[PDB]
Amino acid sequence: PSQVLKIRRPDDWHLHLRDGDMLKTVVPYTSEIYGRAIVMPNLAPPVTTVEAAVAYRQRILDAVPAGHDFTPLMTCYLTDSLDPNELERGFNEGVFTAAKLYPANATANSSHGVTSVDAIMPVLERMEKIGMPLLVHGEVTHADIDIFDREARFIESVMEPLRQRLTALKVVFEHITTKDAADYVRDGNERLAATITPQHLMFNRNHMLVGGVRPHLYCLPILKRNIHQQALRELVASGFNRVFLGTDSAPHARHRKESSCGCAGCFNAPTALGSYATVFEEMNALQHFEAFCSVNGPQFYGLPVNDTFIELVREEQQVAESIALTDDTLVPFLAGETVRWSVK
Amino acid sequence: SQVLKIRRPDDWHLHLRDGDMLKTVVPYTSEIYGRAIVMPNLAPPVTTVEAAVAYRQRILDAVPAGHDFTPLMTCYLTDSLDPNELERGFNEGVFTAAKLYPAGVTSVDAIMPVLERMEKIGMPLLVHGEVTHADIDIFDREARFIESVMEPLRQRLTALKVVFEHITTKDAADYVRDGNERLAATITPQHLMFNRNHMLVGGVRPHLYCLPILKRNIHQQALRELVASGFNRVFLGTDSAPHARHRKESSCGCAGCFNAPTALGSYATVFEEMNALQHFEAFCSVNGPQFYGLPVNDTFIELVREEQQVAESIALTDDTLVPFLAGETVRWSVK
Ligand SMILES: NC(=O)N[C@@H](CC(=O)O)C(=O)O
Ligand SMILES: O=C1C[C@@H](C(=O)O)NC(=O)N1
Ligand SMILES: [Zn+2]
Ligand SMILES: [Zn+2]
Ligand SMILES: [Zn+2]
Ligand SMILES: [Zn+2]
Structure with missing residues (x-):
């Protein structure tokens, strides 16, 4: 009989659900499998108020198929103009589970982003005071920094100084995506955790660039050299308990991916969980798989572990070539491939 | 506006393709360049004298009347090519050079008799210098080739x-700079103008995707310094490598920049920025002929520093062709 892997129902600690018709298409891929997900706030315009988060949460719930037990955990997009009182109210009311910091840029509109991290210290201090977790997309985006170096540079110039400034954050x-980050997280304290996507465990930059350019593997932070991939694999396989499942499923229509300027992001919600199983199996580390998927995130966030179970079966299945949208189509992660593990 | 008059250039590394694509792209080269080295990587490749003669005629058929353009043909090396076939083509003026692609040839040691014949007859070897082993990071493949293939080959065949x-790398720039009069290089406009950030920051840009892949800025800067120094064994080779739009913009986009329409003005900009216009003519019009033992062109063209607006697309029989720098501006124009 085909091998079965039973786990406590997982959660996705980093997800993009988009909005409108695309949200309606993509939510079911998450809600059928995961009990909760951290829903990122990078809509156009971004979610920067309690009222917007409440309304978005309801649009997500509207799109969940009958019978799926799925709870979206909302986030606030940090911006220069965000009122710390607004963030705190949302946290106190259970609307915002966390706040998300995207890379700083001096040219950012104060309504849409952060100009410098120093400029938002009032909101960061407030998060520290109230115990609200900060989720970081840790890259520095200065034009003179090579794209492959942007994560490592963030550790030195932003992450470490911030954590020294606000010791309770x-x-x-x-x-x-890097050995730099893997080591930094491994050597950190109980207030520091990380998520890792399936693509950054499965692939490295050669997979995106050798034999052709593959925009469906193009995402930020960019896939790195093999040595970084291996460090990430070793970190999850070690059993380190402050790393956890975050897909960064980030859907874009096919025409927006396969263009003269392809958008960053992998639509991996359909195939992520089986992909993680494949990686943990290859690393001879299936004894750490459930904790990664279903325990470590809840522990870090101070939330309960799910009390239902799901099963993956080690039986080969073909991934769809594409998934229809109202207009155009979505190309899933591993489209058309035969995969080793799927959900029963 | 500033005007720069130069000897008519040549393109020492060009892909013209075949069929309808050839008809579309040839005029962008023939209107400007006196000669070009026409690469042999057709499907199937040009590996015989007969095939090269027929291809040359198809190219000439596509050259507008009044363009004095001569294609210089090449042979695609393979592990099993007959050295006599290659020499015959050289002696007949059919093959100007032979091109070594990484695997076709199973290995270089496998082609030593062909390479020995080339050395004896004075036929230049054109090398796409990358190693191919799956575990080698794509950005390392040029540097690794220098140590494991290029330096051993040149030590074995010292007259080749x-x-x-x-x-595309500082590694290669330094190797060539420090080499002897039997080693030269070509450099494309894209590897002087851009680095990998331009291909990957803010979106993935398949029209900048080509082999060898764009490298880190430090490599770009080394290439710029090399051409700006006046070093006389580097010369213009566009590697203009056209593919239809939806072969580029696809789930697995093809490698190659269609830069023939914009290359010359793009090079002029680089030389100007590097305060090295005194070395521009030699790069475009003298160094390559010197290395190949061919006369320099006897006509002259002018560039003017007036912005040229690059077309968004070029019509094909099916699909379109997106020029390198589509919709952008080039600072220098051909008068
Ligand atoms: N440079 C490229 O990316 N492509 C060239 C091949 C080559 O010059 O090696 C082509 O012919 O398409
Ligand atoms: O930081 C990001 C954003 C995400 C998206 O498309 O929302 N896509 C990515 O590849 N990374
Ligand atoms: Zn991110
Ligand atoms: Zn994200
Ligand atoms: Zn080449
Ligand atoms: Zn080429």
Whole structure:
């Protein structure tokens, strides 16, 4: 009989659900499998108020198929103009589970982003005071920094000084992609965690660039050299308990991916969980798989572990080539491939 | 506006393709360049004298009347090519050079008799210098080739003339700079103008995707310094490498920049920025002929520093062709 892997129902600690018709298409891929997800706030315009988060939460709930037990955990997009009182109210009311810091840029509109981290110290101090976790997309985006160096540079110039300045702040280093970040997180304290995507465990930059350019593997932070991939694999396989599942499922229509300027992001919600199983199996570390998927995130966030179970079966299945949208189509992670593990 | 008059250039590394694509792209080259080295990587490749003669005629058929353009043909090396076939083509003026692609040839040691014949007859070897092993990071493949293939080959065949095509690294720039009169290189406009950030920051840009891949800024800067120094064994080779739009903009986009329409003005900009216009003519019009033992062109063209607006697309029989720098501006124009 085909091998079965039973786990406590997982959660996705880093997800993009988009809005409108695309939200309606993509939510089911998450809600069928995961009990909760951290829903990122990078809509156009971004979610920067309690009222917007409440309304978005309801649009997500509207799109959940009948019978799925799925709870979106909302986030606030940090911006220069965000009122610390607004963030705190949302946290106190259970609307915002966390706040998300995207890379700083001096040219950012104060309504849409952060100009410098120093400029938002009032909101960061407030998060520290109230115990609200900060989720970080840790890259510095200065034009003179090579794209492959941007994560490592963030550690030195932003992450370490911030954590020294605000010693009680809880931080998730999202979607880490480098040995630099893996080591930093491994050597950190109980207030520092990380998420890792399936693509950054499965692939390295050669997969994106050798034999052709593959925009469906193009995402931020960019896939790194093999030595970084291996460090990430070793970190999850070690059993380190402050790394956890965050897909960064980030859907874009096919025409927006396969263009003269392809958008960053992998639509991996359909195939992520089986992909993680494949990685943990290859690393001879399946004894750490459930904790990564279903325990470590809840522990860091101070939330209960799910009390229902799901099963993956080690039986081969083909991934769809594409998934229809109202207009155009979405190309899933591993489209058309035969995969080793799927959900029963 | 400033005007720069130069000897008519040549393009020492060009892909013209075949069929309808050839008809579309040839005029962008023939209107400007006196000669071009026409690469042999057709499907199937040009590996015989007969095939090269027929291809040359198809190229000439596509050259507008009044363009004095001569294609210089090349042979695609393979592990099993007959040295007599290659020499015959050289002696007949059919093959100007032979091109070594990384695997076709199973290995270089496998082609030693062909390379020995080339050395004896004075036929230049044009090298796409990358190693191919799956575990080698793509950004390392040029540097690794220098140590494991290029330096051993040149030590074995010390009289062989070699062009290190489309160099992309400080490693290659330094190797060529420090080499002897039997080693030269070509450099494309894209590897002087851009680095990998331009291809990957703010979106993935398949029209900048080419082999050898764009490298880190430190490599770009080394290439710029090399051409600006006046070093006389580097010369213009566009590696213009056209593909239809939806072969580029795809789930697995093809490598190659269609830069023939914009290359010359783009090079002029680089030389100007590097305060090295005194070395521009030699790069475009003298160094390559010197290395190949061919006369310089006897006509002259002018560039003017007036912005040229690059077309968004070029019509094909099916699909379109997106020029390198589509919709952008080039600072220098051909008068
Ligand atoms: N440079 C490229 O990316 N492509 C060239 C091949 C080559 O010059 O090696 C082509 O012919 O398409
Ligand atoms: O930081 C990001 C954003 C995400 C998206 O498309 O929302 N896509 C990515 O690849 N990374
Ligand atoms: Zn991110
Ligand atoms: Zn994200
Ligand atoms: Zn080449
Ligand atoms: Zn080429």
